[PDB]
Design a protein around this ligand. Sequence first.
Ligand code: HEM
Ligand code: HEM
Ligand code: HEM
Ligand code: HEM
Ligand SMILES: CCCCCCCCCCCCO[C@@H]1O[C@H](CO)[C@@H](O[C@H]2O[C@H](CO)[C@@H](O)[C@H](O)[C@H]2O)[C@H](O)[C@H]1O
Ligand code: SF4
Ligand code: SF4
Ligand code: F3S
Ligand code: F3S
Ligand code: FES
Lengths: 257, 127, 239, 239, 520
Amino acid sequence: MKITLKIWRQKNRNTPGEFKTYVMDNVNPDMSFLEMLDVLNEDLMSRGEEPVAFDHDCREGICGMCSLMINGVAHGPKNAITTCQLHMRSFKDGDTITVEPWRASAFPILKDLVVDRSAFDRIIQAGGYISVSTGSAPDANTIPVSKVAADRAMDAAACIGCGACVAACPNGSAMLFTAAKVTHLALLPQGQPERYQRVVNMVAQADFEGFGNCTNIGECAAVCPKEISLETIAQLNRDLVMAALRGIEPNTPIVPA
Amino acid sequence: SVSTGSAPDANTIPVSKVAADRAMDAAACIGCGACVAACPNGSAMLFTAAKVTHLALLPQGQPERYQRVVNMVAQADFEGFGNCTNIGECAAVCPKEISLETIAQLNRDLVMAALRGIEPNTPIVPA
Amino acid sequence: MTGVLTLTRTSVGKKVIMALTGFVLVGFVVFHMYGNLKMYQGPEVYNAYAAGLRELGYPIFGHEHLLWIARFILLASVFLHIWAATSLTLQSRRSLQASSISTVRRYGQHKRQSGYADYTMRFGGVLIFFFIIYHILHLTFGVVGYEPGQFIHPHGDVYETYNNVVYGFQNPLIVGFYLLTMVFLALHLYHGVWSMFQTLGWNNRTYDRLLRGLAIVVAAAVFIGNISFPLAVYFGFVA
Amino acid sequence: MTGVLTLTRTSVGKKVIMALTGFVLVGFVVFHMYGNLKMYQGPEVYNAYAAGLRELGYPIFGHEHLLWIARFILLASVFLHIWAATSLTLQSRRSLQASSISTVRRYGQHKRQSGYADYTMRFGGVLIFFFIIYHILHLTFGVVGYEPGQFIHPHGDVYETYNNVVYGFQNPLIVGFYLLTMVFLALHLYHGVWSMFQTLGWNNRTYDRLLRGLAIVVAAAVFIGNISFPLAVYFGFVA
Amino acid sequence: VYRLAQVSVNIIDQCVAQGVPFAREYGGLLDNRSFGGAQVARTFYARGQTGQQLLLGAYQALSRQIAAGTVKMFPRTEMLDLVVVDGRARGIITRDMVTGKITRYAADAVVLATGGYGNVFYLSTNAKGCNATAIWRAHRRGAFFGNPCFTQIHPTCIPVSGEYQSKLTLMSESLRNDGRIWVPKKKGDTRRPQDIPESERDYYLEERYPSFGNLVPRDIASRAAKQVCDEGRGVGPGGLGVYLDFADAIKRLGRQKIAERYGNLFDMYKQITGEDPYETPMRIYPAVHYTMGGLWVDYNLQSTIPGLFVIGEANFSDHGANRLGASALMQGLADGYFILPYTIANFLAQVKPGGVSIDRPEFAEAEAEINQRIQRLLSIRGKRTVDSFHRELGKLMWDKCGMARNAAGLREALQRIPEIRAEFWENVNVPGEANDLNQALEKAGRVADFLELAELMCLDALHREESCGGHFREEYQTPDGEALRNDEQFSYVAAWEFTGDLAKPRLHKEPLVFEYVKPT
Ligand code: HEM
Ligand code: HEM
Ligand code: HEM
Ligand code: HEM
Ligand SMILES: CCCCCCCCCCCCO[C@@H]1O[C@H](CO)[C@@H](O[C@H]2O[C@H](CO)[C@@H](O)[C@H](O)[C@H]2O)[C@H](O)[C@H]1O
Ligand code: SF4
Ligand code: SF4
Ligand code: F3S
Ligand code: F3S
Ligand code: FES
């Protein structure tokens, strides 16, 4: 396959970026998208140009490192997959593919396609956990969790933290990520003691970090690799309304280190 | 649906004496079918409602109660029993004096399960 | 996965549907008896009530808009009621058919201890269905049970409901049909007012007697008023 | 610690405020369309409706008391709606200013799979705000869009709302402005009727399609009625 | 091993308390499953991402501690050297991966939890960034490498579509319980695998090895697969792969139940390769998966350097010559939650806090060494890329120090590894600058450490004149192909000391005595 690539190239955070065009004479349909970027990087290194930098660790769709806006869609045209799980058989010969980072105020760009997604870490730090210390846990079968609640909480908990919901959201909102964590911890009994605080804190943190609001559009759910539903956002909304009825005040925001 | 070996300590979950007494009142069902015979509709509502009430009054029966009632009610339909006109001739002949509050509890459970969109599973076909 | 519409799947859910539609129909029957009690006030008050049923909320709602919403709700409720009643009667007949003395006898002896609510409820429901059809054709439309030149149809906002009622309960057969339907509707209410609470689960030991008393009160009130109307018209008290 | 007033602290809480005020405003818009449908009923019916809006519950409530309570509720709801919309729009703009290709492009390509609800909601909201101001100045007060001697202010209990409506949609520019606002209000309702349920958490898998259908029904009804009004007045159907 | 098995129960309690969404039964209680070859159902799982949920619970606890201010998190920061002051691990030298800044951190104790070195073979199931830099730098500073040659492979891995690929996706070995491994009899066949007739299929592992029928151990089957692919008979884009066919099982069993058993795997395979395994055979190839070698640690999880603690896959510890399934997550969570808190407190209670700052000459020497190494890597400007050298190294290590090892092959590898290292240091291309997001620089550093680690791995494999678990010597095997141990002479842990010469490390035997589980 002959593939034309329009890739965002940015030197660093301050330097303005642009689109550079790279022509791949031979692309294997079985070759993955990140593998094709690797071949392009090897070609650039042999030619003497600056290689394209992109985040990637697992190449399995589970770690959440890969974060590419491919042809206007987060993680490429094919849904329920990641950038690493996208292979070149999803494209055609002669196609032009535009490769971008995540565009969000809270997700700063550090390099050509690398994005700083530590705002998600700070959202998690603001209550996205169960405050249980090591050694104090009771027997693993002391509290029953219904198979339905466990399955729904595993559906929400399957969030690789890629930030593609923020990238595809027209508002640049972290609502799907936050709502997935809120729903995961709120469907289990162990997350009951601190759930109405947690949602508030988490929502406040997402505001503090610079994310937008939710217009209930659904692009976040459309591009989610793990098919995390908008029911998670409805659950977060129910939790926040219930916490407002209880007069739950957000804590101090998690400032960066 | 608890398997052998996985049960926690027997005093882990507190069951109030009132709830335990009511669940023992419902659980005292000898499965004679006299409710079906006395029922003008030939309905198994007293037996089914006794089991539903016994398992729904205990915490251990919470994780699968709204499914269970639906399934059980559907099975009673599939087996060929009639409906309940709230006549009460079931409770008049019951050897163990299972009350009609068990049927009211089953009705509450089924309404709550309908609100949750609980779909009955496939029926238990005879062997 | 379907939602509340899963109630159609079970017999208990069908009975819950019948309990809700019976709540609606009991409310309508009580309100209708109360409204028809205005015939003893005189032709003017009764006709004003009939006309104002159409002008309900006139400065805001159009003519007959609230009345047509009420009519649609009543029709949907009675249709769901009749469908569920037919399904459940058929289910219980199938439940009884296989093991029985004959097609009619179930047991060589069945001494009853908790009344005969099934027999009265089913036969009275069929009678009430027939009465509703004949009653809509009788008093609402005036196409049955009337001599030519006695029923006045409302053309404008002037209503002759009192005249139609007075000319309606002249045939002793029609009065007897209304009386029999009111007896079976009294039995229907006497069972069903308590039964709709028992079907939704809104019952226990402490409130069972209170709900039985409420059922008796509702049934007695509706029976007394609804048999007073045709008897008084036939005997000349209402003229 | 400040109670329900903690909703103002979060963007999700402000969105919940928008959902509640949008419940109120959707209800008012539907009721308004239903009331204005009385133009086709006639001038007498339309003016009676206009007068009975003010004389709502007269033997118990004073003149215009219920209408002024409704006006205050509408004003508070729309003010909270506009304030929260402004805050949320500013937040979402700041959420994209830093990392974007321009001030008008976020991505070199951003293909959309789930609708353009942000664009329509925000632009239609600004248009609806302008339309509300102009439409109050136009039909309620008659200080804009009227030739001299065409608008009749209320004189006691005699209302000429039909005359004001007839003389209002004569300029084709006003008709076009109303039609454009109704198009954007149709888009507003089509998204927002579903979105206000999703914002309060009153949504799931099984009722999502039902709420989308309810949103479509509400938006279509309001759009059809509210564009029929000025088109019919302009074309001479209403005169 | 007993301590790990004894704290596993606390591990599961802690994970369930942390909110890990383990599989539940309908009655609300936890659900267990069995691995392949285990006789009990002792495994607690999320649906197919147990490790994700375990790490999510641990990362949520870590985030709680970051919010509490007790933990300072430094992501995108690579530890490039270990600073040893007065014989104690008193700090580290790291490089920020975004700004390129070299930073010195001082601590009373250093814990190495840096994972395994399975990427010394280029083709492995590990993540792209997995490396041996931390444990190799600690080894050069004085930590002993315990059994480096002990490496585990995975049988069922999705092969590569070309020389560019370096990652083989792991597939549940259970795909081997219901499939048949075969290869076309013609060396070069243009026919579709489904169109190949039954008599023209070489069903190796069935024609050979009549024992262990359809249940061949992963090591024997994978050695056979590698031999077939090396003979030119393997299938796939590069010939590195064999046909795990499911056609006969689909015909025999119900396709619905086969879907219920392998639906996620088949969908993932169709996503990665583009071929439906319900009709065409699936293609698989062995890949290096785990390294149960690592820095030698004592019962206190402490290495040869006092104050340096190695936990998780980075240490040798208690997996022996073969790590059981679902035991590395167990071991990592045990070391983190219920062992290191005690042993590190035992170490710290016997020393005074503080007393070492980053202004010590040792920190400056380590930082100067790291800076010189980075400058040298950036200044070579050769004609070969970093991944070319890594691919050559991994090919040699997989051919010579992989599932099948012998004396002559290991001696050849021990001859070639220094040559590849010299060619790397003379002819590698590392573009970019030091103070930038230079991913080629990070890869260059990791491969520079791999080139030294591979020589030690080969020396350890040549040392151990026996087969045990993953370590398989062709000269010491049963006629069935199983590993043949020498418990009289090799019943020890080989901890290797860095002596300054990469070809001559010092061997330290740690004798093994078994009082409760007698060898057999
Ligand atoms: C004004 C009209 C009617 C009213 C107010 C009314 C009221 C009621 C009420 C409240 C119940 C109790 C529901 C429950 O037990 O949950 C009931 C039961 C019943 N009704 Fe009606 N009903 C009416 C008309 C009819 C009609 C027209 C039919 C049949 C064509 C009918 C047949 C039945 C039957 C068969 C039952 C009981 C079935 C069972 O319990 O298994 N009813 N009715
Ligand atoms: C003897 C007692 C009754 C009298 C005197 C009576 C009187 C009337 C009259 C005069 C009408 C015509 C007015 C109109 O259609 O709006 C009417 C309609 C009606 N009646 Fe009755 N009725 C009686 C019993 C009942 C009962 C027991 C029911 C039970 C369902 C019932 C249901 C209706 C219905 C549904 C209408 C039509 C309402 C409408 O079209 O708006 N009636 N009744
Ligand atoms: C005719 C009166 C109006 C009605 C019936 C109406 C209705 C609605 C409804 C139901 C929603 C959904 C709320 C939610 O998603 O929770 C909504 C959202 C919205 N409305 Fe309105 N609205 C009206 C006037 C306005 C005005 C005057 C503005 C001026 C800015 C506006 C701007 C918006 C915006 C911006 C949103 C979405 C907020 C976001 O982007 O997150 N609306 N509207
Ligand atoms: C073409 C369709 C419409 C027509 C024919 C119409 C007609 C009228 C008329 C004649 C009035 C003056 C009566 C009064 O002020 O009390 C009025 C007032 C009003 N209209 Fe509309 N309107 C239309 C669309 C809308 C829409 C879409 C809204 C949405 C918010 C709206 C909101 C109002 C409000 C708030 C008032 C003032 C109510 C009051 O002062 O009591 N109208 N409308
Ligand atoms: C027609 C009259 C009404 C409309 C005109 C007035 C519009 C006013 C809104 C313009 C923007 C100012 O709006 C103001 O937004 C800020 C931050 O954006 C919100 O600020 C608050 O919430 C945000 C996140 O949601 C956080 O910064 C913080 O929790 C708090 O400061 C205020 O609650 C709101 O008052
Ligand atoms: S919710 Fe989905 S898209 Fe958003 S971060 Fe999580 S996995 Fe990625
Ligand atoms: S009569 Fe009573 S004891 Fe016998 S089966 Fe029915 S409920 Fe059980
Ligand atoms: S697309 Fe954006 S507006 Fe909300 S529903 Fe998804 S985060
Ligand atoms: S008598 Fe029969 S109708 Fe119901 S309440 Fe008892 S099973
Ligand atoms: S690289 Fe891990 S999700 Fe793609």
